[PDB]
Every structure is written in structure tokens, then in C-alpha cells.
Amino acid sequence: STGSATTTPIDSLDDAYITPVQIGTPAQTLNLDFDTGSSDLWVFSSETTASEVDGQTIYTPSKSTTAKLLSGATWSISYGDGSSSSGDVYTDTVSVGGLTVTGQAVESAKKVSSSFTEDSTIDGLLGLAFSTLNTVSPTQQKTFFDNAKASLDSPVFTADLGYHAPGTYNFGFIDTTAYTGSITYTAVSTKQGFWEWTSTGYAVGSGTFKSTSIDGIADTGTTLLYLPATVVSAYWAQVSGAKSSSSVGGYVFPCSATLPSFTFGVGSARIVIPGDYIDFGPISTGSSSCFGGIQSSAGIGINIFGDVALKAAFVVFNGATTPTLGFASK
């Protein structure tokens, strides 16, 4: 089997991407944030504290003939950005882009933190990291991909995120028309439960490539590119007036600037992030200070190849017995 679904930016900055997902019988379609940095499929629901729902579409398990309470199971997750959610668990039928999993754990939120409430466009998350990170207790649950894998034509999914435009998540096949040149594959460590890999270096604009190993994660659920302070300083030093602002919480730059590209290495291959992808616009409405899309990972504890990086590539998440990651230009 295969599936193919369009993913759409939630706003004009590509802050996140939503993908329609069918849950239950008859189908309830919710728009979920596909997150290769976590491993819980959780939704706003009829059980979510009413004051914490503001515009989201909810899953109502009592209206699904295929929903079953997973008795005794609870979940609770805290994300790197300080947001969180928790609740109980149902199993139900879940379909993405025509690919159907029966008995998928659907984690129903009883509570969500303010950042989730405030984002009316995101009805929940669909985790695509390794199932070892799943938070369901006392019986850990599998991700949608893990459940689907054996039925897939090939044990892969691909992320093809758009810049200020829709893109695609495919399951079970590699669309050879969706990228240019060849796909370069690179080793993955699953030791921390992430799609963790090592970039071979970087360049800033038309500058020379610096060969250096940068361990990090491929994370569709993080907006920006978070890299070591040395690398980030070298990038922003090429933008007149750019500076790190403790008050704003990262690097800002004059909105009048033209940003240089940023290149990262995948083996001997190179992925080029155009400068425009690194512009996240005014820090506040009407400001002439703009927020940068490359930020320091210092004190996150991990480097994160988030959407800024991933949307410059066609990315293969290869879930074979020994997982790997593939990157192609597009």
C-alpha cells in the first residue's frame, strides 16, 4: 500500500504545516502537524477542557463506531519549546492520503497548553519519530508509520515541504518526479529516538565550504534551523546590522537586508537554503527588525534541522531495519 497527502503552511511565514487526517468511522477529518521529532498522535477532542479549545476541530470518539477506549492508558508530553498536552487514549482507524491503519492509538487531549489553544489551525500532532519516544503509559504505543510499515510497498515516508506553498507527505514510495539529481543517503542513529544524522559541513552564501561534523535531527515539527553558535555567528556576520537580541530571544536583522543562502552537507552532496527561506519577518507588526530563521542551538542540547532546512530538500525517512535519511535537491 501507499499514501499521499498534501501538507499546507498554517500561515504566511511557514510557521508549521498541516496535513488532513481521517480518524474514525464515519471519518472525522482533523488537520494535524506531522512531527518527525516526536512519537505521539494526539488530537483536540470532545474531552479537551472547553476553555482550552479555541477554533480547533475536535475528535469525538463517541461518534466513531470503530473507537475503543484503551483502558487505563494515559499520556503526557512536554515539547522542547515548553508546550505540553496530556490525556487518555482510544484506538481507532486512521487514514492519511488513502493509507489506512486500523487499531491506531489516538491520544485524546484532556489538557493542552496555551500555545496549542492559541493556534486555531492545528488540531493535533502526528508523530513520526521512533516509537521508543511514545509517551503512552503503562503500555507504550506505536506511531502511525510503525503500524503502517509492514503493509507499505517500501518501508519509507518522504517529506517535501513547500516554501510559502503546499507540499507533500508520501508513505510507501519515493516519487522520482519530485526531486532533481540523485538522493544522497546518510546514516541515522536511533539511540535518542530521533531521526538523528551527521551533516558534513556548511557554507554561507558564496563562501567556501567548511568541512565539519554537525550531529542533529531531521524535525518537521520545528520551524527553524538550530545549529552550533559558531556556525550561526558565521552566518549572521554576513548580514549588515544583524545581532543576537536577548530581549527578542535570538538573532534579528534589518528588514531591509538581502539574506545570503546557507548550504549544508549531506555526505559529499550539498543542500542550498535560499536566503529568503531564512526571513521570518518583523519581530512585531510594523517593526523594521526581522527575525532570523537560523538560530543557535546552544542550550537546546541538540542541533535541529527544522523546516527551514528540510523545505529546501526532498527528504526520505527510510524506516528499513537499519534506518537512513536521504536528501535530494528539488
Curated annotation (Swiss-Prot):
Keywords: Aspartyl protease, Disulfide bond, Hydrolase, Protease, Signal, Zymogen. Disulfide bonds join C255-C290. GO terms for molecular function: aspartic-type endopeptidase activity. It catalyses: Hydrolysis of proteins with specificity similar to that of pepsin A, prefers hydrophobic residues at P1 and P1', but does not cleave 14-Ala-|-Leu-15 in the B chain of insulin or Z-Glu-Tyr. Clots milk. Its EC number is 3.4.23.22. The active site is at D35, S199. Residues 17-328 form the Peptidase A1 domain. It is an enzyme of class 3 (hydrolase). One of its GO terms (biological process) is proteolysis. Belongs to the peptidase A1 family. This is Endothiapepsin. It comes from Cryphonectria parasitica (Chestnut blight fungus). The gene is EAPA. The chain holds residues 90 to 419 of 419 of the full protein.
